[PDB]
RNA sequence: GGGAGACUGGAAUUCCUGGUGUAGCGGUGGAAUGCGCAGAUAUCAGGAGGAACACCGGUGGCGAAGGCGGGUCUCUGGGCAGUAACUGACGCUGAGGAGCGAAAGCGUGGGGAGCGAACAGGAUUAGAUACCCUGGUAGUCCACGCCGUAAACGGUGGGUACUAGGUGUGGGUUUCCUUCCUUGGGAUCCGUGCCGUAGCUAACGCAUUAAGUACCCCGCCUGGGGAGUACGGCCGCAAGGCUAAAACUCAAAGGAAUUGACGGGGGCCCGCACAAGCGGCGGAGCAUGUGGAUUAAUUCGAUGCAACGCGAAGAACCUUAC
C-alpha cells in the first residue's frame, strides 16, 4: 500500500439467488476452507427465513444491512502525547462488508444450537431492527457523533 | 504597497483631536497596525502612533480593547 | 436559588481545568475541577477530563436552574473546546464565547528559562 | 580560532583565582 | 529611542479587607516536598506598594565607543543639504597625559511587587554539593561617590586620492513627458544592506563601506608551556587593576580546506513496518531444547536480533568424547 492502491478482486454473482450479496455472505461465514458446508447453512437460513416470515428475501436481506448500516467511523491518529479518535465518513462497500461481518458475528453469539435458525433469525429480527447488532449499530453512531469535537484534525 | 495617504498635497493634518482618522488605523482589539498594512511613509507612521498614545492619555481610545 | 441567566468561567492550563458558575454578578452557584472528578496528577489535564469536570459542573449548576450562559474563557489549550462542547451538551444554553486571558504590558519579569 | 586554547588559559585563570582566594588573610597579615 | 531634570498613564503580578463558594490547588517525564479544610484554588468589589513600558517595532533612526524607544513640559549636544556672504592653510596623526566607559562588586541613606547567587527540603542516580520542583537573603531600583574591567567583535587604528556594474532602504535639493493625483522618470550629496569584474589571499572570502592601487602618523607581533605568574613600583576602603621577567621543559603548538567514520542532527524513499483484515502464542495436558539445582558423571559446542524441534537426517549396548 505505499505504492498505490491495490486492485480489487470482481465478485461472483451467485448461481441460485443471482445476488453478489449471498455469495459476500456465504464468503465472510466461510471458514477452514469449505465451501459446501457454510453454502449449505446460508441456504437453509435462507429457506427458513422464506417459509418463516413468507416474504422476498432478497429485499428483506437488503433491508436488514440498511437498518444495520454504520454512518460514520471513528479511527484513532496519535498526535500531542495521546491518541485521538477522529470520526472520518465511510465508503458504502466497506459499510456493507463489516456490516455484514457484525451481523455473521452476532448469528455466532446467538445461543439456540444451531445457525442454520440463528441467521436466519437475526436477519428476520434486522428486518424489525430488534437485535443486538442494530443497538449496538445505535451504540456507534451515538459514540461518533458524542466525540465529534476532533473535528478540525480531519484525519 | 499602497502609496501613503499624507504624503499626498491634500492630506490631512495628524492630530489627536480626530477620533475617527485614528479609529481608521488601530484595529478591532484597539492596537496600532503596522506600516505594512497601510503603506504610509515612516514619518507619517510614527506620528499616527504617537497621536494614538496621546489619545489613549486623555481618554479617547480604549487601552486595548 | 433560582437564577434564569448567569454565566461560566473556564480555566484550563497545562496542569488543570477549573470551571465554575456564576452569576452575572460574580457570585459563584456551583464549580467542579478536573481533580474533583477522579482524576489524581498528570492525568488531569487531559481533555476527558475537562469534559467530565464541565459536564458535572454544568449538572450541577442547573440542579439550581441556569438555562443561558456567556462562557468566559481563559488561559493556554489544555480542554478549551472539550468544556464548551460538555456545556452544550450537558443542557446550557451559550450566549457568547469571550476569551479573557491577561496580557501583560512589559511589566514584572517571568522566571527563568528551564534546561 | 578553536576553542582549545580558551580554555587552557581560562583553566590556568581559575586555578590563580582560587590560590588568591585561598590565603587572603595569611597575605592580608604578611603583607602589612 | 542623543542627554539631563520634573510631573504623570494603563495593563499585569503580589498583598490586605469584604461578598459568593466548596474540597481540593500547585508541580512534573512521573512524582514528592508545599498551600488548604481554622475556609484554599476559583470568582466579584475596594485599597497599598514596587518595577518594566505589549501593539507601532524592522536588518529602521541617533551617538566617539559604552549605549538609547509609555506620555507631556523645561534646559542642552551632534549631523545633513542648499546659498556660497566671511577668514585665508589656520590641516593629519598624536608617545606620555586627561576624560568617558556594559554587567557584576564596594561605601553611606532610603526602597523592596516580581525575579534570584549563597542556603534549606523534594525528586532522579551506584553516588547529585547540578540540571527538574517548592521557599528564599544579598542583589536588581533611587541619591551621591569609588573599581575601570568583557567574545568592550566588523576578532578589520586614524586621514586623503584612484579602480566594471546590478539591486533594496533612510535624509535632502533639482530638470523633463506630465494627469504636475502620483516612488512617472532622470540628475545629484550623505548614510545603510545584498550580489557580483579586475586585483589580492594559504584557503575561506574581501571586493567603491576593500582584506585592491598609493602617501603620512600612532599602536602591536618574533615557537608552545612556565606566565599576564613571581619580584619591585603606582592606583584602590576591599575585590583587584596596571608595568613586567627568569630558572626549567617540549619537537612541536597552530590556520584553511579534502576524504571516510560517527551523532542520544535534520530531509526524502522503500519493506507484512505500521494501518485495514484472517489465523494464532502467553491460559491446561503432552513432546522436544535451554537456564537453574542435585549427582559418579549428568560429555562438549551454541547465548539479543543473527542461541534456545540448533551440531544430532535416529543416545537400551554400539554413538560415547562422561
Known sequence: ?155 | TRKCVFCSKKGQTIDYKDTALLRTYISERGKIRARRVTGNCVQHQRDIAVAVKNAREVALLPFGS | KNVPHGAAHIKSTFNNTIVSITDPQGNVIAWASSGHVGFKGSRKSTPFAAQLAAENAARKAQEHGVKKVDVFVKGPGSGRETAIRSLQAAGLEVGTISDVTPQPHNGCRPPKRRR | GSVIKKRRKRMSKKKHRKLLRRTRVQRRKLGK
Open chain 1, 1 to 155: 500500500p505505499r505504492k498505490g492502491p491495490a486492485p480489487k478482486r470482481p465478485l461472483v454473482n451467485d448461481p441460485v439467488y443471482g445476488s453478489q450479496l449471498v455469495t459476500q455472505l456465504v464468503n465472510k461465514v466461510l471458514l477452514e476452507g469449505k465451501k459446501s458446508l457454510a453454502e449449505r447453512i446460508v441456504y437453509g437460513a435462507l429457506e427458513q427465513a422464506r417459509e418463516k416470515t413468507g416474504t422476498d428475501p432478497v429485499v428483506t436481506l437488503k433491508r436488514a444491512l440498511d437498518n444495520v448500516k454504520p454512518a460514520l467511523e471513528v479511527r484513532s491518529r496519535r498526535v500531542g502525547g495521546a491518541t485521538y479518535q477522529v470520526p472520518v465518513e465511510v465508503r458504502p462497500d466497506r459499510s456493507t462488508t463489516l456490516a455484514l461481518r457484525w451481523l455473521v458475528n452476532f448469528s455466532r453469539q446467538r445461543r439456540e444450537k444451531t445457525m442454520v435458525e440463528r441467521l436466519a433469525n437475526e436477519i428476520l429480527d434486522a428486518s424489525n431492527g430488534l437485535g443486538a447488532s442494530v443497538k449496538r449499530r445505535e451504540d456507534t453512531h451515538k459514540m461518533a457523533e458524542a466525540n465529534r469535537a476532533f473535528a478540525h484534525y480531519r484525519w
